[PDB]
Write a protein that binds this ligand. Sequence first.
Ligand code: FDE
Ligand code: FDE
Lengths: 450, 452
Amino acid sequence: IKEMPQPKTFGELKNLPLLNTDKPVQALMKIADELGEIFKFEAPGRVTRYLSSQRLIKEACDESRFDKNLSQALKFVRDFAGDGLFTSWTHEKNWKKAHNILLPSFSQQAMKGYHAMMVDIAVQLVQKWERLNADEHIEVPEDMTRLTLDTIGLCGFNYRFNSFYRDQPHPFITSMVRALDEAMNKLQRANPDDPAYDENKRQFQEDIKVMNDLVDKIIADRKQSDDLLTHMLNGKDPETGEPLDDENIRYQIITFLIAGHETVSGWLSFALYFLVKNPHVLQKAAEEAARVLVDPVPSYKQVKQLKYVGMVLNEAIRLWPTAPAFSLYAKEDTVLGGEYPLEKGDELMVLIPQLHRDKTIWGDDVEEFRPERFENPSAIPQHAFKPFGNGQRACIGQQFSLHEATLVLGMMLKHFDFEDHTNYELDIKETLTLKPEGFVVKAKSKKIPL
Amino acid sequence: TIKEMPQPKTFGELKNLPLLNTDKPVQALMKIADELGEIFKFEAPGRVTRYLSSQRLIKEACDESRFDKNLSQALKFVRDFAGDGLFTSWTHEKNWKKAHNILLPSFSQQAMKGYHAMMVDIAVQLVQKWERLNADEHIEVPEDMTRLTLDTIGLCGFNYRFNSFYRDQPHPFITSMVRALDEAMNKLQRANPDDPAYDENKRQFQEDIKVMNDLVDKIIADRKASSDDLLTHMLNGKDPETGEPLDDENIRYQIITFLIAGHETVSGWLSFALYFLVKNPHVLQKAAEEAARVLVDPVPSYKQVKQLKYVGMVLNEAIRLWPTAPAFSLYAKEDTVLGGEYPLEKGDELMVLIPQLHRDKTIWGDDVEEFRPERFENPSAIPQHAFKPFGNGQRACIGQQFSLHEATLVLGMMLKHFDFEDHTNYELDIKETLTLKPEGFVVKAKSKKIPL
Ligand code: FDE
Ligand code: FDE
């Protein structure tokens, strides 16, 4: 039962200066590489422990001892998402209520309903790229969020953002980035009440009104369908017989627009990066897509058969998990790993990109992109691969993402050949999530019609 | 016949508490009363209470020899900032009867003639706000009603001007007060009060207590500068029974109590009164007939307000359907049997479900859900204890004369100066803090172009 490592302190500022970058998650990974499986991290008022090894995280994922915690990041995001599924505490009224009301919308059969609409937007993406003249290129992260925002909008709410009819980023997304960017910058503000932050605070509200105005436009377009929005309005709580409060329903819409398109958007962009940097892996998935997608538009069953594309997807999110961390707190007093005592209420952070690079589980080539590690999904021991959270607070849209990413990635491989014409150097922008910045490619159409 | 009491589904050691995990508990209890009848038991971990809905038993609960006002768990939570004020006091406490005798003079008929000028001040400000809206704009009723009623309690009670109509967003006192009242209501439904989910709530609650006290510190200090209003009786008056004036801790509680109770239920009341009228245009047209008839001066006099009797009936039929203070609690002085059927031990508590009492078919007929102001044309015809929107007995509402005069004046001038359009076909949505208000009620107002 020994003492815990800790990085450099700056007097009364503690460890806060060490995350004084636009890339805090990558700075924590360096500290993890420098200090190991666990280290203590102090801020003016907060203290947290970062876990990097599967040995300690395996006990942290035990729901008998640990419960989902709202990190200082989520408490700031709660300023515009409120008590929706992502930023809710487990033991507060609306998490249980809404979790059970929304869960039918993510069943395997609900996915069959989404498929036609997912195919709608994916065809729009293929048609955008097929109409590029020979000199033009593609901005990967921008066209992916065009697609992922449109999917969550059409399937969830029957609302058309028409992102492909906008050369500019969609206004909802542009202020959302600023709101998520603001939240992350507040984690680095020592004294958030300095007058210097008065422009920053007023812009922050300006961006929330933009997010709420769109939601009221989504609500006004309804009040003919059995989508996710019908379920928010109509589902009863079995114990009380009542539907979700209107203020919560606005909160869940925001949550799904954000969590339901950004992490999928980063995902697809990373998968395209690793393919275009590993050209043999790209032709093996291109062979599978040419084999399985035999129709002008894909069917639901065909997506289920793109086994190798799926492994590409799992190996990308292993290397770069687009939601990079989740937080826990100590239900009751306990000792961690038989060496580290924790009092009730002590907080842990699972550093997901560090868990997925644990040499002791994945072998001594953790940093290489090898999709063939997931040819045997069962081989990997429990709690070693945690890109979607843990337990009852794990990602509810866990199958929706996989189907959307697989379908979209499948059709791109069927219809285009991709050249990394600039020799792109991977640069990971951090909002609270991860995405490659300025990643561009060229796509020669294989001239297969739709 | 002595009989066992109805009780809805139980959820283990949580008892009946899961049933009220909603944003609108009073309308949920009206659903339970509708299905289990005139009385049911409701259990929570530490507490037990029985909810009454029918006049036959509620007239029995209104017997002051057997039952005395009880502080429900909701009132005990408000006591965290209302303290020893009139509303959160036990009848047997030293500071209830003391403060009651000191402040009751301020709500007399003789005081009412003095307030009339100040009420007109606020009311004219509201009229002028609506006359200066551009053609496309609309009116959010509860927000402008709180602007009116709060400015009224400030000026009439403390000679203090909140200037709520010179503000775009709510007054900061109003936001901190509602968040405090919202907290108090939500602590009632909460299973595990030490869960980390509630640290922000405890923080924010304390943040909201300091702002309400700071504002009271501004009112008290602003007088040490400078009258014969309610605050003068608080500071200078002495109790006629004991010859003691009020404790300085207690005076701070009385100012808070009157800021809350002296504007919140009147603003909801007017909002509902305006709601039912845009929904019954024959009733609305009849009420503007009387206001155009009686209010012949640019501003109304005290005598003219007392001559608006149909407008008053509109207000009474409004508050029957939606009593903005929806319940009050009682406890049993001694062991007694209620209705000859339900035995109660000494100290057991009761709750009066006022919107259900006002929905008794045995008293009001088979159209209790219809908005008919003409039930109040015959003042004597109502049975006793059938209409209890202002509490009971010695703990009844001290300002019901005050509220009625304020509400009737404002409702009267609105009818004289405007035509009201329900341009959205507004669907009634009743937000619950601990009181009742319509939430998103909006209307448009055509100026009748009558000068002031
Ligand atoms: C719609 C959608 C879509 C999606 C996607 C995704 C991707 C790609 C990735 C991801 C992730 C994730 N998620 Fe995700 N997602 C979603 C969602 C969600 C929600 C709602 C949540 C929360 C849940 C609960 O709690 O209930 C999540 C969730 C999630 C998580 C966890 C959180 C915490 O904090 O714990 C993670 C890690 N997600 N994700
Ligand atoms: C100033 C003012 C104004 C007013 C108004 C009103 C309206 C509109 C309604 C109402 C109500 C009421 N209230 Fe009212 N109000 C007031 C007040 C008051 C007070 C102070 C009280 C307490 C009394 C004794 O107890 O002493 C009341 C009170 C009252 C009541 C009772 C409570 C109990 O718990 O019992 C009720 C129900 N209120 N309200």
